[PDB]
Amino acid sequence: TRDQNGTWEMESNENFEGYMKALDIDFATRKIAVRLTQTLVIDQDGDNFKVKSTSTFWNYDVDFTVGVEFDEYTKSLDNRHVKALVTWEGDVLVCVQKGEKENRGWKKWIEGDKLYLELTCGDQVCRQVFKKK
C-alpha cells in the first residue's frame, strides 16, 4: 500500500555499516551508529511527507513533496550537497539523491504491518524493517 503514515520501530538492520562506510562516515561515528536501533516517524498527506529518524545518537527530520526536486545538505550524516527527488514506482516510494555518490538514495514500502527501507550508496545496500507501533 502507498499509505506510510505512522510511528515505526526498528525490528531489524542489515549492513548499516556498509552503507555508512560507503558514505565515508568517520570510523568513530560509524562504530557507535552501526550498533544502534532506530525509530522513524512519518506524517503523510497527499504528496506531502514529514519524516523523523532517531536513535540515542542522532535525531533528524526531513520534509518533502512527492515529485518536487529539492536540495539537500546532509549535515551530520556525510555533509554533502545532493539534489533529491522522491517519486512512486507502483507502491514503492523511491528517492534518488543526485550527487557525488553513485546509486545513492532509498526505497521504502509497506508489506503487512511493516515498513521496509532499502538505503543505497555505491555498491552497498542496507535493509531495515520497522513495525507499526
Side-chain angles (χ1 to χ4, degrees), residues 65-75 77-90:
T65 302
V66 171
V68 174
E69 188 176 73
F70 58 108
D71 296 280
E72 285 202 294
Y73 308 86
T74 57
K75 299 272 151 195
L77 191 60
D78 63 314
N79 208 347
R80 292 191 165 96
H81 183 202
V82 295
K83 282 196 172 295
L85 177 61
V86 186
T87 58
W88 294 107
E89 291 180 0

PDB file of all heavy atoms in Angstrom, residues 65-90, unseen atoms left out:
ATOM      1  N   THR A  65       7.879  16.909  -0.812  1.00  0.00           N
ATOM      2  CA  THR A  65       6.690  16.682  -1.626  1.00  0.00           C
ATOM      3  C   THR A  65       7.072  15.771  -2.757  1.00  0.00           C
ATOM      4  O   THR A  65       8.066  15.993  -3.466  1.00  0.00           O
ATOM      5  CB  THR A  65       6.166  18.037  -2.143  1.00  0.00           C
ATOM      6  OG1 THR A  65       5.891  18.860  -1.019  1.00  0.00           O
ATOM      7  CG2 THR A  65       4.925  17.822  -3.036  1.00  0.00           C
ATOM      8  N   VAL A  66       6.301  14.675  -2.892  1.00  0.00           N
ATOM      9  CA  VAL A  66       6.467  13.756  -3.980  1.00  0.00           C
ATOM     10  C   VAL A  66       6.411  14.529  -5.305  1.00  0.00           C
ATOM     11  O   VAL A  66       5.502  15.347  -5.503  1.00  0.00           O
ATOM     12  CB  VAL A  66       5.381  12.661  -3.934  1.00  0.00           C
ATOM     13  CG1 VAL A  66       5.428  11.825  -5.193  1.00  0.00           C
ATOM     14  CG2 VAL A  66       5.562  11.802  -2.692  1.00  0.00           C
ATOM     15  N   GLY A  67       7.418  14.259  -6.100  1.00  0.00           N
ATOM     16  CA  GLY A  67       7.514  14.792  -7.449  1.00  0.00           C
ATOM     17  C   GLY A  67       8.085  16.185  -7.533  1.00  0.00           C
ATOM     18  O   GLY A  67       8.114  16.737  -8.652  1.00  0.00           O
ATOM     19  N   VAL A  68       8.587  16.705  -6.402  1.00  0.00           N
ATOM     20  CA  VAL A  68       9.200  18.067  -6.420  1.00  0.00           C
ATOM     21  C   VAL A  68      10.644  17.953  -6.037  1.00  0.00           C
ATOM     22  O   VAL A  68      10.937  17.548  -4.868  1.00  0.00           O
ATOM     23  CB  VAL A  68       8.492  18.980  -5.467  1.00  0.00           C
ATOM     24  CG1 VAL A  68       9.228  20.354  -5.390  1.00  0.00           C
ATOM     25  CG2 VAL A  68       6.939  19.194  -5.879  1.00  0.00           C
ATOM     26  N   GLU A  69      11.571  18.273  -6.930  1.00  0.00           N
ATOM     27  CA  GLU A  69      13.001  18.160  -6.595  1.00  0.00           C
ATOM     28  C   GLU A  69      13.380  19.150  -5.503  1.00  0.00           C
ATOM     29  O   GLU A  69      12.886  20.284  -5.483  1.00  0.00           O
ATOM     30  CB  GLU A  69      13.858  18.361  -7.829  1.00  0.00           C
ATOM     31  CG  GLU A  69      15.312  18.070  -7.612  1.00  0.00           C
ATOM     32  CD  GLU A  69      16.098  18.192  -8.907  1.00  0.00           C
ATOM     33  OE1 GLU A  69      16.308  19.335  -9.348  1.00  0.00           O
ATOM     34  OE2 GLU A  69      16.456  17.141  -9.478  1.00  0.00           O
ATOM     35  N   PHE A  70      14.282  18.742  -4.603  1.00  0.00           N
ATOM     36  CA  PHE A  70      14.737  19.653  -3.577  1.00  0.00           C
ATOM     37  C   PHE A  70      16.211  19.443  -3.250  1.00  0.00           C
ATOM     38  O   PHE A  70      16.704  18.318  -3.320  1.00  0.00           O
ATOM     39  CB  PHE A  70      13.895  19.499  -2.302  1.00  0.00           C
ATOM     40  CG  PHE A  70      13.882  18.114  -1.703  1.00  0.00           C
ATOM     41  CD1 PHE A  70      14.569  17.850  -0.506  1.00  0.00           C
ATOM     42  CD2 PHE A  70      13.134  17.092  -2.227  1.00  0.00           C
ATOM     43  CE1 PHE A  70      14.518  16.603   0.086  1.00  0.00           C
ATOM     44  CE2 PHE A  70      13.076  15.833  -1.629  1.00  0.00           C
ATOM     45  CZ  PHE A  70      13.797  15.600  -0.455  1.00  0.00           C
ATOM     46  N   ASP A  71      16.887  20.531  -2.930  1.00  0.00           N
ATOM     47  CA  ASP A  71      18.252  20.475  -2.469  1.00  0.00           C
ATOM     48  C   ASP A  71      18.322  19.922  -1.060  1.00  0.00           C
ATOM     49  O   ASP A  71      17.462  20.168  -0.193  1.00  0.00           O
ATOM     50  CB  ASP A  71      18.897  21.861  -2.517  1.00  0.00           C
ATOM     51  CG  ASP A  71      19.002  22.390  -3.905  1.00  0.00           C
ATOM     52  OD1 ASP A  71      19.936  21.979  -4.616  1.00  0.00           O
ATOM     53  OD2 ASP A  71      18.166  23.238  -4.276  1.00  0.00           O
ATOM     54  N   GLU A  72      19.366  19.139  -0.840  1.00  0.00           N
ATOM     55  CA  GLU A  72      19.643  18.626   0.487  1.00  0.00           C
ATOM     56  C   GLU A  72      21.077  18.865   0.873  1.00  0.00           C
ATOM     57  O   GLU A  72      21.953  18.719   0.041  1.00  0.00           O
ATOM     58  CB  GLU A  72      19.390  17.129   0.544  1.00  0.00           C
ATOM     59  CG  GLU A  72      17.986  16.736   0.570  1.00  0.00           C
ATOM     60  CD  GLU A  72      17.854  15.388   1.132  1.00  0.00           C
ATOM     61  OE1 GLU A  72      18.327  14.428   0.493  1.00  0.00           O
ATOM     62  OE2 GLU A  72      17.312  15.293   2.243  1.00  0.00           O
ATOM     63  N   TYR A  73      21.305  19.258   2.125  1.00  0.00           N
ATOM     64  CA  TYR A  73      22.625  19.246   2.725  1.00  0.00           C
ATOM     65  C   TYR A  73      22.530  18.194   3.810  1.00  0.00           C
ATOM     66  O   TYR A  73      21.666  18.263   4.704  1.00  0.00           O
ATOM     67  CB  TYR A  73      23.000  20.646   3.228  1.00  0.00           C
ATOM     68  CG  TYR A  73      22.799  21.606   2.085  1.00  0.00           C
ATOM     69  CD1 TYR A  73      21.543  22.180   1.835  1.00  0.00           C
ATOM     70  CD2 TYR A  73      23.832  21.879   1.180  1.00  0.00           C
ATOM     71  CE1 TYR A  73      21.337  23.018   0.732  1.00  0.00           C
ATOM     72  CE2 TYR A  73      23.630  22.717   0.081  1.00  0.00           C
ATOM     73  CZ  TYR A  73      22.383  23.280  -0.136  1.00  0.00           C
ATOM     74  OH  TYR A  73      22.184  24.118  -1.210  1.00  0.00           O
ATOM     75  N   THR A  74      23.321  17.124   3.671  1.00  0.00           N
ATOM     76  CA  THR A  74      23.202  16.006   4.565  1.00  0.00           C
ATOM     77  C   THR A  74      24.131  16.193   5.813  1.00  0.00           C
ATOM     78  O   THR A  74      24.949  15.321   6.182  1.00  0.00           O
ATOM     79  CB  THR A  74      23.540  14.684   3.863  1.00  0.00           C
ATOM     80  OG1 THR A  74      24.865  14.825   3.328  1.00  0.00           O
ATOM     81  CG2 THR A  74      22.571  14.460   2.697  1.00  0.00           C
ATOM     82  N   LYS A  75      23.936  17.318   6.475  1.00  0.00           N
ATOM     83  CA  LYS A  75      24.687  17.731   7.660  1.00  0.00           C
ATOM     84  C   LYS A  75      24.634  16.745   8.842  1.00  0.00           C
ATOM     85  O   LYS A  75      23.575  16.315   9.273  1.00  0.00           O
ATOM     86  CB  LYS A  75      24.175  19.125   8.063  1.00  0.00           C
ATOM     87  CG  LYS A  75      24.406  20.179   6.966  1.00  0.00           C
ATOM     88  CD  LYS A  75      25.760  20.754   7.175  1.00  0.00           C
ATOM     89  CE  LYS A  75      26.377  21.228   5.943  1.00  0.00           C
ATOM     90  NZ  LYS A  75      27.824  21.394   6.332  1.00  0.00           N
ATOM     91  N   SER A  76      25.788  16.393   9.369  1.00  0.00           N
ATOM     92  CA  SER A  76      25.861  15.335  10.398  1.00  0.00           C
ATOM     93  C   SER A  76      25.270  13.973   9.957  1.00  0.00           C
ATOM     94  O   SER A  76      24.890  13.147  10.791  1.00  0.00           O
ATOM     95  CB  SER A  76      25.182  15.786  11.700  1.00  0.00           C
ATOM     96  N   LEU A  77      25.168  13.753   8.654  1.00  0.00           N
ATOM     97  CA  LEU A  77      25.324  12.409   8.129  1.00  0.00           C
ATOM     98  C   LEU A  77      26.711  12.436   7.476  1.00  0.00           C
ATOM     99  O   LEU A  77      27.726  12.389   8.172  1.00  0.00           O
ATOM    100  CB  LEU A  77      24.213  12.045   7.153  1.00  0.00           C
ATOM    101  CG  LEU A  77      24.193  10.573   6.781  1.00  0.00           C
ATOM    102  CD1 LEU A  77      23.986   9.613   7.958  1.00  0.00           C
ATOM    103  CD2 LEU A  77      23.135  10.276   5.735  1.00  0.00           C
ATOM    104  N   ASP A  78      26.783  12.567   6.150  1.00  0.00           N
ATOM    105  CA  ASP A  78      28.091  12.732   5.493  1.00  0.00           C
ATOM    106  C   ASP A  78      28.446  14.158   5.001  1.00  0.00           C
ATOM    107  O   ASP A  78      29.501  14.383   4.384  1.00  0.00           O
ATOM    108  CB  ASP A  78      28.169  11.806   4.285  1.00  0.00           C
ATOM    109  CG  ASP A  78      27.149  12.139   3.226  1.00  0.00           C
ATOM    110  OD1 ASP A  78      25.960  12.358   3.541  1.00  0.00           O
ATOM    111  OD2 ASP A  78      27.492  12.094   2.040  1.00  0.00           O
ATOM    112  N   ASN A  79      27.578  15.120   5.255  1.00  0.00           N
ATOM    113  CA  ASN A  79      27.891  16.528   4.964  1.00  0.00           C
ATOM    114  C   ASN A  79      28.152  16.882   3.496  1.00  0.00           C
ATOM    115  O   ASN A  79      29.145  17.499   3.166  1.00  0.00           O
ATOM    116  CB  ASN A  79      29.111  16.950   5.809  1.00  0.00           C
ATOM    117  CG  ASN A  79      29.111  18.399   6.108  1.00  0.00           C
ATOM    118  OD1 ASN A  79      28.354  19.142   5.500  1.00  0.00           O
ATOM    119  ND2 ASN A  79      29.965  18.831   7.019  1.00  0.00           N
ATOM    120  N   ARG A  80      27.230  16.467   2.625  1.00  0.00           N
ATOM    121  CA  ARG A  80      27.308  16.669   1.179  1.00  0.00           C
ATOM    122  C   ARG A  80      26.041  17.355   0.698  1.00  0.00           C
ATOM    123  O   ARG A  80      24.987  17.270   1.349  1.00  0.00           O
ATOM    124  CB  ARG A  80      27.476  15.322   0.434  1.00  0.00           C
ATOM    125  CG  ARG A  80      28.851  14.645   0.703  1.00  0.00           C
ATOM    126  CD  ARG A  80      29.015  13.505  -0.264  1.00  0.00           C
ATOM    127  NE  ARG A  80      30.407  13.057  -0.309  1.00  0.00           N
ATOM    128  CZ  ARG A  80      30.873  12.039   0.402  1.00  0.00           C
ATOM    129  NH1 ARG A  80      30.061  11.387   1.239  1.00  0.00           N
ATOM    130  NH2 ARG A  80      32.155  11.706   0.286  1.00  0.00           N
ATOM    131  N   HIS A  81      26.153  18.018  -0.449  1.00  0.00           N
ATOM    132  CA  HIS A  81      25.018  18.545  -1.150  1.00  0.00           C
ATOM    133  C   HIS A  81      24.544  17.523  -2.160  1.00  0.00           C
ATOM    134  O   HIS A  81      25.316  17.055  -3.000  1.00  0.00           O
ATOM    135  CB  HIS A  81      25.377  19.874  -1.825  1.00  0.00           C
ATOM    136  CG  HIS A  81      24.213  20.517  -2.522  1.00  0.00           C
ATOM    137  ND1 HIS A  81      24.354  21.441  -3.535  1.00  0.00           N
ATOM    138  CD2 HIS A  81      22.876  20.372  -2.336  1.00  0.00           C
ATOM    139  CE1 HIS A  81      23.158  21.822  -3.950  1.00  0.00           C
ATOM    140  NE2 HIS A  81      22.243  21.185  -3.240  1.00  0.00           N
ATOM    141  N   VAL A  82      23.261  17.215  -2.101  1.00  0.00           N
ATOM    142  CA  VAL A  82      22.626  16.434  -3.171  1.00  0.00           C
ATOM    143  C   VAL A  82      21.350  17.077  -3.693  1.00  0.00           C
ATOM    144  O   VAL A  82      20.734  17.867  -3.022  1.00  0.00           O
ATOM    145  CB  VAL A  82      22.303  14.977  -2.688  1.00  0.00           C
ATOM    146  CG1 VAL A  82      23.621  14.226  -2.392  1.00  0.00           C
ATOM    147  CG2 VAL A  82      21.348  14.970  -1.482  1.00  0.00           C
ATOM    148  N   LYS A  83      20.913  16.646  -4.862  1.00  0.00           N
ATOM    149  CA  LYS A  83      19.577  17.058  -5.392  1.00  0.00           C
ATOM    150  C   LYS A  83      18.659  15.873  -5.264  1.00  0.00           C
ATOM    151  O   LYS A  83      18.913  14.862  -5.925  1.00  0.00           O
ATOM    152  CB  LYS A  83      19.613  17.502  -6.885  1.00  0.00           C
ATOM    153  CG  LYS A  83      20.165  18.907  -7.079  1.00  0.00           C
ATOM    154  CD  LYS A  83      19.834  19.464  -8.492  1.00  0.00           C
ATOM    155  CE  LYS A  83      20.236  20.936  -8.588  1.00  0.00           C
ATOM    156  NZ  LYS A  83      19.450  21.830  -7.688  1.00  0.00           N
ATOM    157  N   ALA A  84      17.650  15.972  -4.383  1.00  0.00           N
ATOM    158  CA  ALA A  84      16.793  14.830  -4.032  1.00  0.00           C
ATOM    159  C   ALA A  84      15.450  14.898  -4.787  1.00  0.00           C
ATOM    160  O   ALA A  84      14.901  15.961  -5.019  1.00  0.00           O
ATOM    161  CB  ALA A  84      16.567  14.810  -2.562  1.00  0.00           C
ATOM    162  N   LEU A  85      14.929  13.751  -5.148  1.00  0.00           N
ATOM    163  CA  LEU A  85      13.650  13.630  -5.755  1.00  0.00           C
ATOM    164  C   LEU A  85      13.011  12.345  -5.267  1.00  0.00           C
ATOM    165  O   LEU A  85      13.636  11.291  -5.352  1.00  0.00           O
ATOM    166  CB  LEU A  85      13.821  13.633  -7.263  1.00  0.00           C
ATOM    167  CG  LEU A  85      12.564  13.450  -8.069  1.00  0.00           C
ATOM    168  CD1 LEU A  85      11.590  14.543  -7.824  1.00  0.00           C
ATOM    169  CD2 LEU A  85      12.931  13.319  -9.586  1.00  0.00           C
ATOM    170  N   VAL A  86      11.799  12.440  -4.780  1.00  0.00           N
ATOM    171  CA  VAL A  86      11.056  11.261  -4.245  1.00  0.00           C
ATOM    172  C   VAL A  86       9.815  11.056  -5.116  1.00  0.00           C
ATOM    173  O   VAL A  86       9.013  12.005  -5.318  1.00  0.00           O
ATOM    174  CB  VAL A  86      10.622  11.445  -2.760  1.00  0.00           C
ATOM    175  CG1 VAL A  86      10.007  10.136  -2.238  1.00  0.00           C
ATOM    176  CG2 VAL A  86      11.823  11.835  -1.927  1.00  0.00           C
ATOM    177  N   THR A  87       9.675   9.893  -5.652  1.00  0.00           N
ATOM    178  CA  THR A  87       8.573   9.576  -6.554  1.00  0.00           C
ATOM    179  C   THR A  87       8.024   8.164  -6.258  1.00  0.00           C
ATOM    180  O   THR A  87       8.645   7.384  -5.479  1.00  0.00           O
ATOM    181  CB  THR A  87       8.994   9.613  -7.986  1.00  0.00           C
ATOM    182  OG1 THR A  87      10.076   8.676  -8.162  1.00  0.00           O
ATOM    183  CG2 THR A  87       9.453  11.024  -8.401  1.00  0.00           C
ATOM    184  N   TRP A  88       6.888   7.775  -6.847  1.00  0.00           N
ATOM    185  CA  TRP A  88       6.343   6.457  -6.711  1.00  0.00           C
ATOM    186  C   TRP A  88       6.690   5.564  -7.889  1.00  0.00           C
ATOM    187  O   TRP A  88       6.580   5.985  -9.065  1.00  0.00           O
ATOM    188  CB  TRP A  88       4.831   6.491  -6.589  1.00  0.00           C
ATOM    189  CG  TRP A  88       4.335   7.125  -5.350  1.00  0.00           C
ATOM    190  CD1 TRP A  88       3.728   8.386  -5.209  1.00  0.00           C
ATOM    191  CD2 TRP A  88       4.322   6.523  -4.050  1.00  0.00           C
ATOM    192  NE1 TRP A  88       3.386   8.590  -3.890  1.00  0.00           N
ATOM    193  CE2 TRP A  88       3.700   7.465  -3.160  1.00  0.00           C
ATOM    194  CE3 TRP A  88       4.734   5.283  -3.558  1.00  0.00           C
ATOM    195  CZ2 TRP A  88       3.547   7.211  -1.800  1.00  0.00           C
ATOM    196  CZ3 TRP A  88       4.585   5.033  -2.194  1.00  0.00           C
ATOM    197  CH2 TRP A  88       3.976   5.993  -1.328  1.00  0.00           C
ATOM    198  N   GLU A  89       7.054   4.332  -7.626  1.00  0.00           N
ATOM    199  CA  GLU A  89       7.084   3.278  -8.638  1.00  0.00           C
ATOM    200  C   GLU A  89       6.115   2.232  -8.117  1.00  0.00           C
ATOM    201  O   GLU A  89       6.444   1.487  -7.176  1.00  0.00           O
ATOM    202  CB  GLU A  89       8.488   2.724  -8.811  1.00  0.00           C
ATOM    203  CG  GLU A  89       9.403   3.698  -9.438  1.00  0.00           C
ATOM    204  CD  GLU A  89      10.811   3.168  -9.617  1.00  0.00           C
ATOM    205  OE1 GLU A  89      11.087   2.015  -9.246  1.00  0.00           O
ATOM    206  OE2 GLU A  89      11.663   3.948 -10.081  1.00  0.00           O
ATOM    207  N   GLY A  90       4.879   2.185  -8.634  1.00  0.00           N
ATOM    208  CA  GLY A  90       3.846   1.388  -8.044  1.00  0.00           C
ATOM    209  C   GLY A  90       3.694   1.859  -6.587  1.00  0.00           C
ATOM    210  O   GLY A  90       3.509   3.055  -6.336  1.00  0.00           O
TER     211      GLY A  90
END
